[PDB]
Amino acid sequence: ASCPVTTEGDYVWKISEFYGRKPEGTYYNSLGFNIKATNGGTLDFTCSAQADKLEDHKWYSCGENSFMDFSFDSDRSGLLLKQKVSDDITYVATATLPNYCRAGGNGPKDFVCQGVADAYITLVTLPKSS
Amino acid sequence: ASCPVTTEGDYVWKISEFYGRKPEGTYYNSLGFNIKATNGGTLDFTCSAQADKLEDHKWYSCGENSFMDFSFDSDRSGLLLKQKVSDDITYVATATLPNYCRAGGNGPKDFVCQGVADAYITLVTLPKSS
Amino acid sequence: ASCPVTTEGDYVWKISEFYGRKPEGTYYNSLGFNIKATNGGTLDFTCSAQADKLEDHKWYSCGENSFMDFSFDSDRSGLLLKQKVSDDITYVATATLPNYCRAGGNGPKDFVCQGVADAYITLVTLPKSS
Amino acid sequence: ASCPVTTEGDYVWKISEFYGRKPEGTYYNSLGFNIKATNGGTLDFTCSAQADKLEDHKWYSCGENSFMDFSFDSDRSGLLLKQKVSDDITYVATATLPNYCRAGGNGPKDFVCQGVADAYITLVTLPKSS
């Protein structure tokens, strides 16, 4: 409404249901979130990754097939998405995914984090080239 | 080259590695194929479905998350894809996926089919509305 | 240690990282948890299900391939697992999966639940027959 | 019947619907097969792997969660399975998966292979230790 955020558009997607697990309270071993189109299109999918230790500032596929890559900066809960549409067109988008972490019960430094608010991202073309 | 087929374009995708299984030599219980962008974009994924009995002229998701649906007419090896880009824009596309079936060994009427040639599809906008 | 729970055995598995989403604060649309062997075997996997509305007291596969089924009673956070080992042998197992739900941000009655403690299940043979 | 093969048992599984793709007619980039219990138990799943280049004599998980690993010797179409049941018990099993390869259409040296017969494997305990 009067929120300083655009919540609909052909190049605007909603990010929701952020999850992550920090098995030792530091790095994530599991991270994910839902991505949905806002323009009445069909797109609605999970973007996630797992590893013994997930890295910051590293591209992960959103899934086995996915046309989308993502990267995370855990220090700022910052998400970066990338979509390469053609040889010459790539979109990127960013957001903060606010979340709350609490003890998960599976070890003395095990924490699980979940989103406390949705975020909206805008996809914008990267100049060809850098 | 001199083939009566367009093999590159922003709205042209390559279909390859068609597979299917007909457990009793009639209906499919498993069907799939690979879809790849031709314009240098990243898109490259598997579209598939399984059921005790897959139906002709029925939409199946390409995968759990997928932004794409497909339907198959097994009588003509005809594929139909659909992509709903927005409230008002939907693309559809069609092709024939030539294939060869041979005995699969898992029952006396078990046949497995695999693609013998790639196919190229063109995505075109459905008039709003029918 | 002095806890009234068995945490290791060939037929004892650890349940951890319970998650669930209640989009309208009532039924789950997403539920899952991790299952791990305690006896030094390799088994370690996710059991989950999604639907527009998940049902209580209904078997869901743990995953596409899984040899395990589960059911949930949301009124008591009660889990039931079933493993059919042979024509004549089926194991079942139960537990409570304690969890905490909090607002998820994706709608005014959206809640996300996560496990606050691990649980241990014991697999026991169902008499042949009921 | 009078076949020199055991087709049923608690430790005997049926292997069927072998598939593989050799993009350049040499190494596989995709390999898979179905595994089913013969004793009336529920087990029935796909074991597969993909990579730019799959390696011989290397363990691959059967799937993301799987309790089973496999390895393949492409020179003899030989399959090896491994199941670690406990700290001290591991089963292994072997078979030949007969198959036929034919041109797949997606490049001049692209071949796709599919099983021509089912195979039966027997799981047997590895002595503790080697």
Ligand SMILES: NCCCCCCCC(=O)O
């Ligand atoms: N006129 C067509 C506008 C809809 C384009 C939306 C593309 C979003 C994307 O996948 O980045």
Ligand SMILES: NCCCCCCCC(=O)O
């Ligand atoms: N100028 C942008 C043209 C590239 C658009 C390709 C969209 C293909 C699709 O997902 O249907």
Ligand SMILES: NCCCCCCCC(=O)O
């Ligand atoms: N002596 C063999 C004992 C290990 C059996 C564990 C089986 C657990 C299961 O999948 O239910």
Ligand SMILES: NCCCCCCCC(=O)O
């Ligand atoms: N008496 C119980 C016998 C059934 C055991 C089958 C175990 C097969 C496996 O997962 O290797």
Ligand SMILES: Nc1nc(N)c(N)c(O)n1
């Ligand atoms: N929706 C969802 N949330 C999660 N925490 C996980 N792990 C998962 O796989 N899917």
Ligand SMILES: Nc1nc(N)c(N)c(O)n1
């Ligand atoms: N970590 C994680 N979060 C999610 N939301 C999902 N779907 C998933 O599979 N994994």
Ligand SMILES: Nc1nc(N)c(N)c(O)n1
């Ligand atoms: N005009 C247009 N641009 C895009 N980036 C996409 N994906 C699309 O479908 N149409």
Ligand SMILES: Nc1nc(N)c(N)c(O)n1
């Ligand atoms: N039937 C089928 N075909 C395919 N090409 C793939 N990837 C799949 O998962 N299933």
Ligand SMILES: Nc1nc(N)c(N)c(O)n1
């Ligand atoms: N809901 C849910 N929870 C999980 N722990 C996982 N792995 C999953 O895929 N989905």
Ligand SMILES: Nc1nc(N)c(N)c(O)n1
């Ligand atoms: N049943 C099946 N066969 C295949 N060739 C493939 N690729 C797949 O994913 N599933």
Ligand SMILES: Nc1nc(N)c(N)c(O)n1
């Ligand atoms: N290569 C391959 N073969 C299969 N039989 C299956 N299920 C799969 O996913 N991939």
Ligand SMILES: Nc1nc(N)c(N)c(O)n1
């Ligand atoms: N006696 C027995 N041995 C095994 N190896 C397994 N898996 C099982 O369920 N029961």
